[model samples]
Target: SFSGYLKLTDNVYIKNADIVEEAKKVKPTVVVNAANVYLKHGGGVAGALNKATNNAMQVESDDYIATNGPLKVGGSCVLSGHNLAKHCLHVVGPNVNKGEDIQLLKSAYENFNQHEVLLAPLLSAGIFGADPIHSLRVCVDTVRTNVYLAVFDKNLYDKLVSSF
Candidate 1:
């Protein structure tokens, strides 16, 4: 498993690891998802989460959309987390620019911080195309005291760790 941690401040830290694996060890009450507005667990972190939880996430997501309609950018929904999680919080971010990135990721943190332990991936900077460091700053700024920013890349993780 990926390992290493950088404490950002009193209430926040970043871990260089997959959040799914992080959940197995940390047992967070809610694991945040970097989701699409369609709420489909189709690719990247969302895809892994779907596979890890035995596709329960997709089932819930499909039903959630069917019931509530699609989630908008900057919105969220929480569903049962099937494996290595008690709950999963899905939040959608805007596609990279104006009406830009960062704010939505921060909003996700706003929604997620209520839990005792939060395992969040950097919301928009993966295949979604948000700038990584800008997104990371949002993470550092908004996380709760005991939150773990489960970063998927060691390269990005190390850069963020040493930059500040």
Candidate 2:
């Protein structure tokens, strides 16, 4: 079982678990992926989601990028495909700047606020290489939707359990 319930509000809560496992168990309406500017199916949670959806997410994401241009830091796009959830909301976070990561993380949540249940991996915490704890805190504070902060990285999970 995944440790959970870092309650931010009556409507918002955070859960820490392997992202795919948590998404499977929760079956949320929307799943937010930590994406890059190119929206390529690469390392970390985005890679896992790409694999889970059998690259369907990538196809949709690519189309979105082509039509709308690449997602800038703090920008996002929502894609529908066969995957762990109904929709995949992809967001581009900071590549190296921690401060930018915070705003981008908040933007991702702000962009996806329509859902009642949103399962999101810790944005920019892995491939983008931001601090997991910091990112998680920003998420907890920013999310207005029913969002689950899925943590696939073992170290990040441990940190989450201890810190929150």
Candidate 3:
């Protein structure tokens, strides 16, 4: 079944669904990630995407660093030619080990203003282990583009579904 939408603007809306499954039907123009500044696609969304794309996504990410070098916390790297979507936008969000830093997450979202259909997970929740609720709030508040907050984890999906 399709989840309901939380319309943020005329173009931007949020929905709850399995991101990997959703991608099969309606692929996004940009798939956003809560990546490390070093661009290591080891865990969380990065890992999943890398696995799904047979490490092709990681290779693309590596090429970005080779051409433009590493990105800082607020910086972004856009890569294409992956199996899941047209492009991937990697941004370094706050480290949960250090606590919730809303500014960093907001900065990451700010870099996403140009994309029309952007699919993003609950940044910093899985790999960095940040609070999902706080991360979602930051994403909802900061995004200026058409974005879909994709929820794959059942625990997270349940929480978000119950809250709204």
Name the best candidate (by TM-score): 1
Which scores greater on TM-score, model 1 or model 3? 1
Q: Candidate 1's residue-wise lDDT over 6-70, tens digit each?
A: 77888777878888888877667788888888888878889988988888789878888888898
| Cα-based lDDT for every prediction | 0.77, 0.72, 0.73
| lDDT of residue 16 for candidate 2 | 55
List the lowest-lDDT window of 10 residues for candidate 3: 1-10
Q: In model 3, what lDDT does residue 69 have?
A: 77
lDDT of 3 by residue, 112-141 (tens): 786766877777777686778777777677
Cand. 3 TM to true fold: 0.84
Candidate 1's TM-score: 0.88
Model 3 local distance difference test score: 0.73
Q: Model 1: runs farther than 4 Å from truth? A: 1-4, 97-102
On lDDT, the leading prediction is 1
- Which lDDT tens digits does candidate 2 get at residues 3-104? 465765565556556677776766667778888878998878888878888888888878877888877888787788365877777877777654564556
TM-score computed on alpha carbons, candidate 2: 0.82
Q: What are the per-model C-alpha RMSD values against the true structure?
A: 2.6, 3.0, 2.8
